Swiss-Prot record:
This is Alpha-N-acetylgalactosaminide alpha-2,6-sialyltransferase 2. Catalyzes the transfer of N-acetylneuraminyl groups onto glycan chains in glycoproteins. Conjugates sialic acid with an alpha-2-6 linkage to N-acetylgalactosamine (GalNAc) glycan chains linked to serine or threonine in glycoproteins. Sialylates alphaGalNAc- and Galbeta1->3GalNAc-O-Ser/Thr epitopes also known as Tn and T antigens. Pathway: Protein modification; protein glycosylation. Its main location: Golgi. Keywords: Disulfide bond, Glycoprotein, Glycosyltransferase, Golgi apparatus, Membrane, Signal-anchor, Transferase, Transmembrane, Transmembrane helix. Disulfide bonds join 1-78, 81-241. It is found in: Golgi apparatus membrane. The chain holds residues 66 to 374 of 374 of the full protein. Aberrant O-galactosylation of IgA1 molecules plays a role in the development and progression of IgA nephropathy (IgAN). Genetic interactions of C1GALT1 and ST6GALNAC2 variants influence IgA1 O-glycosylation, disease predisposition, and disease severity, and may contribute to the polygenic nature of IgAN. CMP-N-acetyl-beta-neuraminate binds at residues 86, 109, 228, 260. Belongs to the glycosyltransferase 29 family. GO terms for cellular component: Golgi membrane. Its EC number is 2.4.3.3. It comes from the Eukaryota.
C-alpha cells in the first residue's frame, strides 16, 4: 500500500531525484561513532554539535541504545498521517473530523487543543518541538488553552536537536529525573511529558536528516538559517508515511487568516516561509501531498 505516495514521487522526475528514503530520520546509539563525532562537531545549530560537550551528548545518546529508538513506526498495513500546523487557516475550518480520521497525527510547538478541537482535532501521535519553543509556547499561549503539551498513552515526543537543552531535556526525560544542569535546570520532565519515562516515549531527529532537508528541499538564499519546526515535521512525515495530509500550513492566501488558529484576535528565528509555502504548493501539484486550502 506504500506505493501510493511513493508512486507519485517516481511519476514526476523533479522530486524523483530529490527524495532519499534511505537517510536515517532518527539519531540513535548505533549511529554514534567517532567518525560522526568528527563531522558533526564541525557544524553548530541543529545541523551538528559544534561547541557541545561530549559528556552530555554521549550520556544522552547512550539511552538511545535500543532498536526502538531508531524508528518512528514499528513493523502489511498502510500508514496515513496528518501533520497539523498552527496556521490561522484552521480557524473555523472545522477540520477536526478529517484530521482525526488519519491513523497518525503530527503536532508541534503551540498545539492548542482545548477550545479548538472541532477545528484541529484531539488525536495526537507525535509531538515535535525544541525545548525553547515548547516552553515559549507554554508562556505565550497559557491563557489561550496551552497549559500542557499533548499527552497520550502511545504518543511519542520528537526532539529537534537545536540546542544543548534538547539533549539535556531528552536525557532527563528518559531517566525520569529533573533536569540537573543548564538553562532548564529544575524542570520536571514528568510535568511536561507525563508518567512514562522510557526510550519508547522520546525520539531525536537526526542532524543529518535536517541538513539533507535544507540542502535538497529548502536551501533558502538566506544562508543561522533553518526550516520551521512545522516544515521539519511535515517533511519527517513525508519520509516515514505512505500518505500525509497537511493542515494549518502557510498558503498563498495566508493573509486572509490570523497568524495562528488559536489567537485571541487577528494576529500578524530565521526561516523562509515563502520557500516553505512554495514547497507545499509543488508537493500538492505533484500529488505527493494533500494540502488543506480554502
Ligand atoms: N501562519 C502559519 C503558522 C504556523 N505555520 C506552521 O506551523 C508551525 C508551528 O507554529 P508555531 O511554532 O507558531 O506554534 C510553524 O513552524 C510553521 O511550519 C505555518 O505554516 N503558517
Ligand atoms: C541517500 O543518502 C545516503 C546517505 O545516508 C547516500 O549514501 C546515498 O547515496 C543516497 N542515495 C541517493 C539515491 O541519493
Ligand atoms: C477566527 O479566529 C479568531 C481568533 O483567532 C476568533 O476570535 C474567531 O472566532 C475565529 N472565527 C471563526 C472561528 O469563524
Amino acid at each position: 500500500c506504500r506505493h501510493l505516495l511513493h508512486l507519485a514521487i517516481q511519476r514526476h522526475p523533479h522530486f524523483r531525484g530529490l527524495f532519499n528514503l534511505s537517510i536515517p530520520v532518527l539519531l540513535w546509539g548505533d549511529l554514534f561513532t567517532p567518525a560522526l563525532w568528527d563531522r558533526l562537531s564541525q557544524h553548530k545549530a541543529p545541523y551538528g554539535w559544534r561547541g557541545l560537550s561530549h559528556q552530555v551528548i554521549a550520556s544522552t545518546l547512550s539511552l538511545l541504545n535500543g532498536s526502538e529508538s531508531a524508528k518512528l513506526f514499528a513493523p502489511p498495513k498502510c500508514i496515513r498521517c496528518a501533520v497539523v500546523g498552527n496556521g490561522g487557516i484552521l480557524n473555523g475550518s472545522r477540520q477536526g473530523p478529517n484530521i482525526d480520521a488519519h491513523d497518525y497525527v503530527f503536532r508541534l510547538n503551540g498545539a492548542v487543543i482545548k477550545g479548538f478541537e472541532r477545528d484541529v482535532g484531539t488525536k495526537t501521535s507525535f509531538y515535535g518541538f525544541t525545548v525553547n519553543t515548547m516552553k515559549n509556547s507554554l508562556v505565550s499561549y497559557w491563557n489561550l488553552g496551552f497549559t500542557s503539551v499533548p499527552q497520550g498513552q502511545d504518543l511519542q515526543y520528537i526532539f529537534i536537536p537545536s540546542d544543548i537543552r534538547d539533549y539535556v531535556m531528552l536525557r532527563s526525560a528518559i531517566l525520569g529525573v529533573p533536569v540537573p544542569e543548564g538553562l532548564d535546570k529544575g524542570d520536571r520532565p514528568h510535568a511536561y511529558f507525563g508518567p512514562e519515562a522510557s526510550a519508547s516515549k522520546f525520539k531525536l531527529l537526526h542532524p543529518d536528516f535536517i541538513s539533507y532537508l535544507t540542502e535538497r528541499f529548502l536551501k533558502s538564499k538566506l544562508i543561522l538559517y533553518m526550516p520551521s519546526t512545522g516544515a521539519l515535521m511535515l517533511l519527517t512525515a513525508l519520509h516515514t508515511c505512505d500518505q500525509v495530509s497537511a493542515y494549518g500550513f502557510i498558503t498563498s492566501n495566508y493573509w486572509k487568516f490570523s497568524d495562528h488558529y488559536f489567537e485571541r484576535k487577528m494576529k500578524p528565528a530565521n526561516h523562509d516561509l515563502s520557500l516553505e509555502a512554495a514547497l507545499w504548493r509543488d508537493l500538492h501539484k505533484a500529488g505527493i501531498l494533500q494540502l488543506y486550502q480554502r
